[PDB]
Design a protein around this ligand. Structure first.
Ligand code: A3P
Ligand code: DE4
Length: 252
């Protein structure tokens, strides 16, 4: 196809929850658009100063005049990006649709038990799981503190529309996952929504976005819980990111 000059603004809003292929989708959108896509890894690795900003925005999110200040801060946080994925953004999908009326919406989904298992290995181990201590030890190497965990918790509560949440309760998390995915599909006009399942690859995505399939580039497969376990163990072993980063090429 011909090469055209794409606008550096949010063109794709992905409402998918963490551990549904968000990092592979981020990578895929960056391959298509050649500009950055937001993700929790953007915060962790490039913009830890954004943590307090997302926390403030969530704090005010329950609240039109008030909306304009909030929408202005969302636009500010996303300046220079061509798409959003992952927490903390995904709970804001309805507001992002208003701010970027010409953006299209994605929802990444998967088997709920595979999702929960992945979530418990990477994002939200149970309180009494010994792996939680290793996760926390590796995170300190990256400069992540209790405010990072607060942002994860609060952005999940915001996405699930809950005042509080028993994070150690699998049944609660599974119900919230199903309800969240059902609500996205009931909210977004079908013309504006593409549901992606793990394994779908390039073709439905590129058709929805009116772009060619990237020539000679396989659809990304990154950020498996096995890979995250290795990342945590290697951070613990070497005590820095820069000592190990060459071992995690497309994930980091
Ligand atoms: N192209 C692909 N095909 C199959 N699974 C993929 C994939 N890309 C990512 N995944 C899976 O999506 C999960 C990561 O999602 P996210 O990037 O949103 O955290 C991981 O699940 P597992 O933890 O079950 O391996 C990973 O294996
Ligand atoms: O809020 N999330 O959804 C969310 C939270 C985390 N936190 C986890 C807890 C343990 N630590 C492991 C690690 C994962 C990746 C990079 C470095 C370290 C971070 C990670 C991802 C997401 C979504 O991509």
């Amino acid at each position: 196809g011909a090469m055209i000059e794409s606008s550096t603004t949010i063109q794709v809003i992905s409402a998918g929850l963490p551990r549904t292929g968000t990092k592979s989708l981020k990578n895929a959108l960056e391959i298509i658009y050649h500009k950055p896509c937001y993700h929790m890894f953007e915060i962790i690795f490039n913009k830890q100063s954004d943590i307090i900003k997302w926390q403030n925005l969530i704090h005010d999110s329950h609240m039109t005049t008030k909306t304009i200040a909030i929408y202005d801060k969302l636009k500010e946080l996303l300046d220079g990006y061509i798409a959003t994925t992952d927490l903390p953004t995904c709970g804001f999908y309805k507001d992002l649709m208003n701010i970027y009326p010409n953006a299209k919406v994605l929802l990444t989904i998967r088997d709920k038990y595979d999702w929960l298992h992945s979530l418990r290995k990477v994002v939200l181990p149970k309180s009494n799981d010994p792996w939680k201590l290793k996760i926390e030890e590796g995170d300190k190497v990256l400069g992540l503190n209790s405010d990072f965990y607060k942002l994860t918790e609060d952005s999940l509560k915001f996405a699930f529309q809950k005042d509080d949440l028993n994070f150690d309760d699998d049944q609660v998390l599974l119900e919230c996952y199903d309800e969240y995915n059902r609500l996205v599909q009931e909210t977004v006009p079908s013309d504006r929504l593409l549901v992606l399942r793990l394994g779908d690859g390039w073709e439905p995505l590129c058709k929805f976005l009116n772009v060619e399939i990237p020539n000679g580039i396989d659809y990304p497969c990154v950020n498996s819980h096995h890979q995250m376990t290795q990342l945590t163990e290697q951070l613990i072993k070497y005590k820095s990111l820069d000592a190990i980063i060459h071992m995690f090429p497309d994930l980091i």
